[PDB]
Amino acid sequence: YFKIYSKHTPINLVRDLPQGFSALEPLVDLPIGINITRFQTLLALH
């Protein structure tokens, strides 16, 4: 079951992940049962 979580915030550190506490709420759980071992992130353009 594909479980998805998130958090969103403004930041100062342009390079990298900041120090200090954060924890993510669940966006969704999906019934989908997929054999997952690889992935890629995506952009879009006109």
Added chain:
Amino acid sequence: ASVYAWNRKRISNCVADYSVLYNSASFSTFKCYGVSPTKLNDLCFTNVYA
């Protein structure tokens, strides 16, 4: 399904008369483990596969 491939999918949100699965006569070719069929309509399930 083939015995090395199965039909495993998530039944969710639903209701049924689960007692049909043992009380309907031609189903009388069965078993249960832990749980018992007469209790199933009062037992709150969660999600189901087969």
